[PDB]
Amino acid sequence: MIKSLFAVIIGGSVGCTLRWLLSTKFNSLFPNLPPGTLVVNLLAGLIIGTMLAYFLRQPHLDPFWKLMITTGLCGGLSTFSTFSVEVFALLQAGNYIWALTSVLVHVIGSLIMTALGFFIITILFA
Amino acid sequence: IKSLFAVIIGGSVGCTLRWLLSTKFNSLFPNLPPGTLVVNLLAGLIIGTMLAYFLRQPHLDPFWKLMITTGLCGGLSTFSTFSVEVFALLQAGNYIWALTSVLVHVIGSLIMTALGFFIITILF
Amino acid sequence: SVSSVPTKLEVVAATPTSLLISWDAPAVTVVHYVITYGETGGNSPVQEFTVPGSKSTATISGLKPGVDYTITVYTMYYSYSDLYSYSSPISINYRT
Amino acid sequence: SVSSVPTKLEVVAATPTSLLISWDAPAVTVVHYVITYGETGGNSPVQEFTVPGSKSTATISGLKPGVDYTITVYTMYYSYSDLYSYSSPISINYRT
Ligand SMILES: CCCCCCCCCCO[C@@H]1O[C@H](CO)[C@@H](O[C@H]2O[C@@H](CO)[C@@H](O)[C@H](O)[C@@H]2O)[C@H](O)[C@H]1O
Numbered sequence: 089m090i091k092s093l094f095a096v097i098i099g100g101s102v103g104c105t106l107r108w109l110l111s112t113k114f115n116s117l118f119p120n121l122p123p124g125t126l127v128v129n130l131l132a133g134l135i136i137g138t139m140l141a142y143f144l145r146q147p148h149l150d151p152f153w154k155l156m157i158t159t160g161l162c163g164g165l166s167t168f169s170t171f172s173v174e175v176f177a178l179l180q181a182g183n184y185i186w187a188l189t190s191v192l193v194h195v196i197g198s199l200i201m202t203a204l205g206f207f208i209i210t211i212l213f214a
Numbered sequence: 215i216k217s218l219f220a221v222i223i224g225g226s227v228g229c230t231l232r233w234l235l236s237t238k239f240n241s242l243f244p245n246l247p248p249g250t251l252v253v254n255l256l257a258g259l260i261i262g263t264m265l266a267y268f269l270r271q272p273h274l275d276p277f278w279k280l281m282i283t284t285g286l287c288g289g290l291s292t293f294s295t296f297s298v299e300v301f302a303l304l305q306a307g308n309y310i311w312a313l314t315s316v317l318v319h320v321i322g323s324l325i326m327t328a329l330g331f332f333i334i335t336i337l338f
Numbered sequence: 339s340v341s342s343v344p345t346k347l348e349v350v351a352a353t354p355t356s357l358l359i360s361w362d363a364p365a366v367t368v369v370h371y372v373i374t375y376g377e378t379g380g381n382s383p384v385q386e387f388t389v390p391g392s393k394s395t396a397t398i399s400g401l402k403p404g405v406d407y408t409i410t411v412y413t414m415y416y417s418y419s420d421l422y423s424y425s426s427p428i429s430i431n432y433r434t
Numbered sequence: 435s436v437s438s439v440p441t442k443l444e445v446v447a448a449t450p451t452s453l454l455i456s457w458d459a460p461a462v463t464v465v466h467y468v469i470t471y472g473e474t475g476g477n478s479p480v481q482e483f484t485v486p487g488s489k490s491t492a493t494i495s496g497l498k499p500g501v502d503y504t505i506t507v508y509t510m511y512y513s514y515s516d517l518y519s520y521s522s523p524i525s526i527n528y529r530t
């Protein structure tokens with residue numbers, strides 16, 4: 089109940105810190121679809137896909153690690169609100185094409201990262 | 215550095231509220247887990263308002279910007295839990311609610327961002 | 339604290355060498371159901387096959403007439419925090 | 435680490451009472467451009483209008499013939515970790 093909390097926070101902080109570091113150094117390189125926010129969403133996409141597969145195969149994995157990796161790392165590493173203002177701005181700057189693209193590349197890109205990581209581990213294990 | 219604290223502090227506060235809200239409420243509607251939706255809508259609202267407000271206040275310390283946006287909002291919102299729910303729905307062959315959850319989340323978040331923004335700008 | 343196990347598993351239609359079972363979905367995102375069966379007494383061996391999460395009926399089609407079978411159904415479901423996991427089974431016996 | 439300030443501010447066409455200016459946009463998501471213009475020779479005072487971030491040109495008109503004007507431009511842009519903010523201005527002089 090508090091050991092759980094501590095899990096959300098270590099995972100979360102490592103996730104948020106990592107996003108921050110990748111966003112501030114790489115987002116400015118490509119305004120129309122800033123690569124920092126894309127990559128972290130994809131990365132978490134990938135990672136939680138592999139956890140779909142791993143958790144399934146390891147039902148007795150400690151809840152503390154499950155919570156830390158998912159709600160923790162992947163929750164705090166990924167981000168909807170930033171994706172959401174980037175798109176909002178592209179819409180206000182009348183750049184609809186890239187508002188639309190950004191929305192697709194994040195959604196599909198992420199589903200695919202999740203498909204990838206999951207199908208890679210349900211083949212590497214069985 | 216100190217602005218790393220702001221990320222950690224705000225982020226862990228955002229991450230925490232997510233944790234509580236999602237566990238308590240996601241199981242109420244499996245086709246569209248209402249916990250991770252509320253956090254996404256709320257984060258988009260908060261960020262929409264901050265967008266408008268920070269504009270009209272250049273000079274409000276990068277630190278407390280850093281904590282609210284890429285801290286609170288970053289730890290509050292999630293893309294990975296959103297993608298994992300849709301994937302599970304796709305895999306269950308539940309395509310309608312998979313498409314629906316994509317629409318509701320994206321459009322809902324954008325509407326929340328626009329609401330937060332225009333409310334503050336249509337205020338002053 | 340929602341249950342991920344199906345309910346009301348039962349034989350709705352029976353031939354002497356096959357059965358039609360149905361259950362009520364557990365009210366979680368069921369990615370697929372798993373059906374098991376095997377002769378109740380001693381040996382068998384047990385067999386398992388899957389049905390899509392959007393199906394709550396299935397047919398078991400190679401049975402020995404006159405024999406008791408044990409049939410279980412469990413889910414693979416998605417849930418928050420646990421992601422993908424297997425549920426507990428619900429079980430019935432049914433002769434023939 | 436990228437400049438949000440427009441470059442190459444220039445008058446492109448001119449009539450005795452109007453100016454067409456163009457600039458190169460900064461590599462940054464620009465929502466709109468603020469354009470200011472007033473008489474270089476002390477108090478006039480300075481007038482302001484905005485232009486959609488799409489555009490990189492603007493018409494200033496309703497000016498006096500044979501007069502020195504100061505024209506400046508800055509951007510209302512989006513960036514990560516500043517959200518909506520304002521850039522430094524770029525500036526030129528043109529005599530009608
Ligand atoms: C469209 C957007 C794409 C975005 C990118 C992500 C793509 C995700 C792929 C979906 O995953 C597959 O979905 C199938 C369909 O749900 C499942 O088949 C299952 O579906 C059943 C029901 O149709 C049966 O037909 C099959 O044999 C099988 O059991 C299959 O197991 C699963 O791996």
Ligand SMILES: [F-]
Pocket residue numbers: 168169170172253254255256257258259291323
């Ligand atoms: F959001």
Ligand SMILES: [F-]
Pocket residue numbers: 128129130131132133134166198293294295297
């Ligand atoms: F993701």
Ligand code: NA
Pocket residue numbers: 162163164165166167168287288289290291292293
């Ligand atoms: Na997040």
